[PDB]
Amino acid sequence: YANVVTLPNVTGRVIIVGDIHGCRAQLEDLLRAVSFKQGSDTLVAVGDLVNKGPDSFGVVRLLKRLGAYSVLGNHDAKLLKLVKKLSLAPLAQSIPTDVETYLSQLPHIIRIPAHNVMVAHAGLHPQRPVDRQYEDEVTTMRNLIEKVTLTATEETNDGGKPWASMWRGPETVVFGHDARRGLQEQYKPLAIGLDSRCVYGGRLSAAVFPGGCIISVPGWNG
Ligand SMILES: [Mn+2]
Ligand SMILES: [Mn+2]
Instruction: Name, in order, each residue with C-beta under 8 angstroms of 193's C-beta and a sequence gap of 6 or more.
Output: 164, 175, 176, 178, 181, 182, 183, 184, 185, 187
Question: Domain limits at 28?
Answer: 1-222
- Please give the span between the terminal C-alpha atoms of the chain, in angstroms, as a whole number: 37
Q: CA-CA distance, 108 to 112, in Å (whole number)?
A: 14
Instruction: Name, in order, each residue with C-beta under 8 angstroms of 3's C-beta and a sequence gap of 6 or more.
Output: 107, 108, 109
Q: How far is the CA of 148 from the centre of ligand 1 (A)?
A: 27
CATH code for the domain in which residue 115 is found: 3.60.21.10
Q: How far is the CA of 177 from the centre of ligand 1 (A)?
A: 4
How far from chain centre, in Å, is Cα 10? 18
Residues in the chain: 222
Q: Which runs of consecutive H residues, i.e. helices, occur in the chain? A: 24-34, 56-65, 74-84, 88-94, 97-104, 135-140
β 143-146/117-120 pair status = unpaired
| Rounded (10°) angle between helices 24-34 and 56-65 | 40
Residue 206 · residue 16 · CB < 8 Å: yes
195 is in an annotated binding site: no
Q: CA-CA distance, 153 to 135, in Å (whole number)?
A: 12
Give the containing element (helix H, strand E) for 144: strand 143-146
Q: Give the distance between the most distant pair of CA atoms in the chain.
A: 47
Residue 133 · residue 125 · CB < 8 Å: yes
Resolution stated for this PDB structure, in Å: 2.0
Instruction: Name, in order, each residue with C-beta under 8 angstroms of 122's C-beta and a sequence gap of 6 or more.
Output: 74, 137, 138, 139, 140, 141, 142, 154, 163, 175, 176, 177, 178
Please report how many Cα atoms fall inside a 13 Å half-sphere around the Cα of residue 187, on the Cβ side.
21
121 is in an annotated binding site: yes
Number of folded domains that form the chain:
1
Residue 163 · residue 143 · CB < 8 Å: yes
Q: What are phi and psi of 80, to 5 degrees?
A: -60, -40
CA nearest 77: which of 123, 118, 136, 20? 136
Sheet holding 117-120, edge to edge: 4-6, 109-112, 117-120, 172-175, 191-193
111 - beta bridge partners? 6, 118
144 - beta bridge partners? 152, 161
Q: Relative to the alpha carbon of 73, which ligand is closest?
A: 2
Q: CA-CA distance, 197 to 19, in Å (whole number)?
A: 7
Give the containing element (helix H, strand E) for 221: none
CA nearest 117: which of 215, 190, 167? 190
Long-range contacts of 52-55 (CB under 8 A, 24+ apart): 52/21, 52/22, 52/199, 53/20, 53/21, 53/22, 53/23, 53/24, 53/199, 53/220, 54/22, 54/23, 54/24, 54/25, 54/220, 55/22, 55/23, 55/24, 55/25
Residue 196 · residue 206 · CB < 8 Å: no
108 is in an annotated binding site: no
